[PDB]
Amino acid sequence: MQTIKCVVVGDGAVGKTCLLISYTTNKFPSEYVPTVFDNYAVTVMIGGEPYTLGLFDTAGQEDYDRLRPLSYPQTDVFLVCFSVVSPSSFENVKEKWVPEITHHCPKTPFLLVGTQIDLRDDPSTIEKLAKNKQKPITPETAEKLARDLKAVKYVECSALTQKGLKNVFDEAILAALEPPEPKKSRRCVLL
């Protein structure tokens, strides 16, 4: 039986751990999540047949830049996440995340995943973004970056309301069935 290893990357605090917990437990975690979601395996049904879906969370923080790629080997699909109400996390998709997974996993498909849809209509969130002369990322804006960065497609979800959450991993499984190729640890020797 074929297994599907799905690795979730993206800036810190974009909701990677929460979207995994809300998807695997059907409950948005209330009060305090682990830094990295404990890697979990679920049997998803696609085409009438079972697939083992392996979900792997990562620490997006800069402090884990050396350790994080060691989880990338034998990855079938990446979820490059950004918060639709965090323009910096969106910028880091082009500036950091897509270059990272492309370096270690050149021929591995990835999806652009906009997280925290619900906050896009939150007045307090809109107000805070406006303070910095910023505004949420529209779906049209993210869809263009997905084509520019050769992403499979742009999907969107809200871990809190589960809106489109099931659809995100459905597209991740479909992208994973596009045959990929193995990964590299870059092999950056020191000293």
């Binding site: 605090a13 830094t35 923080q61």
Partner: protein
């Protein structure tokens, strides 16, 4: 780095000297502590495929990769909590303490128990709406004040206190956290680093009392780092407020409740880099201001 010429009637200089000694030993006591490192090694290897682990084990840099992130986080936290004010902040803390209300007569144990219970009640709507929970927390506060009266504080006292402040949990729950947790966008110490620096905070509390260091400033620093360390699985907020309020009430100061909603997320270093985090001295200033704000009410 020099404070020799500044007015000091709070023993802040003696406080800064404690922080300098603890800071100078932070690398050995935490970053070079093998229990801490073993924790980081095991947690990091859980996300790495076993084929990659066998491959990487032939590279001498592998151990540094497993532990670098964990060490940087603790260093980030230690930088946020280490008290090392500027010459301006030093004199500012001097003026701010003079604005605090301080009662001459120190309350008895029964009275301190009620006031610390009410301070927790003001923070939580659940404690107000649940009389049974408030009575349970009142007993834990009373037990902690009885065992710590006229006796040096110990981690066992804090373990019992924290357990007492978690009566709604259910049996069999781990006392300490089993993994690194994140609060909103904040980072906390690893479980082992939190245990290590929990005992250092206990030593810090005892030495500060023996050295006659200003209790209100002590309470501020203790509040920040306990929240930043987050040693226990649950009840770290309650526990920190009870310990701090004992330090304050033992000195005649009003009990502390909580910082402003705008200022709390600045106590810890964060995962979202856009959030400006407050320095240890800035936390002390806002703490003293909040404490003086309760003298107006």
């Amino acid at each position: 780095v020099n404070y020799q010429d500044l007015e000091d009637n709070l023993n802040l200089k003696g406080l800064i000297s404690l922080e300098d000694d603890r800071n100078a030993n932070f690398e050995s006591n935490v970053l070079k502590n093998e229990k801490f490192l073993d924790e980081a090694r095991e947690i990091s290897k859980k996300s790495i495929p076993e084929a990659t682990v066998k491959q990487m084990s032939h590279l001498p840099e592998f151990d540094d990769i497993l532990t670098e992130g964990a060490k940087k986080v603790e260093s980030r936290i230690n930088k946020a909590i280490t008290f090392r004010p500027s010459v301006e902040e030093f004199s500012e803390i001097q003026d701010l303490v003079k604005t605090l209300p301080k009662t001459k007569v120190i309350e008895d144990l029964s009275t301190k128990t009620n006031e610390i219970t009410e301070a927790l009640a003001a923070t939580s709507k659940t404690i107000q709406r649940t009389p049974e929970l408030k009575e349970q927390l009142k007993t834990a506060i009373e037990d902690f004040l009885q065992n710590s009266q006229g006796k040096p504080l110990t981690v066992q006292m804090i373990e019992n206190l924290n357990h007492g402040l978690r009566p709604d949990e259910g049996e069999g729950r781990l006392l300490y956290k089993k993994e690194n947790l994140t609060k909103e966008n904040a980072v906390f110490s690893s479980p082992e680093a939190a245990k290590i620096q929990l005992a250092e905070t206990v030593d810090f509390i005892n030495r500060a009392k023996n050295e006659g260091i200003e209790p209100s400033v002590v309470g501020a620093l203790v509040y920040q780092r306990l929240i930043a360390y987050h040693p226990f699985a649950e009840g770290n907020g309650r526990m920190a407020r009870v310990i701090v309020n004992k330090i304050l009430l033992d000195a005649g100061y009003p009990a502390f409740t909580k910082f402003s909603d705008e200022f709390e997320p600045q106590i810890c270093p964060q995962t979202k880099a856009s959030t400006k985090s407050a320095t240890s001295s800035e936390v002390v200033v806002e703490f003293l201001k909040e404490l003086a704000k309760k003298g107006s009410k």
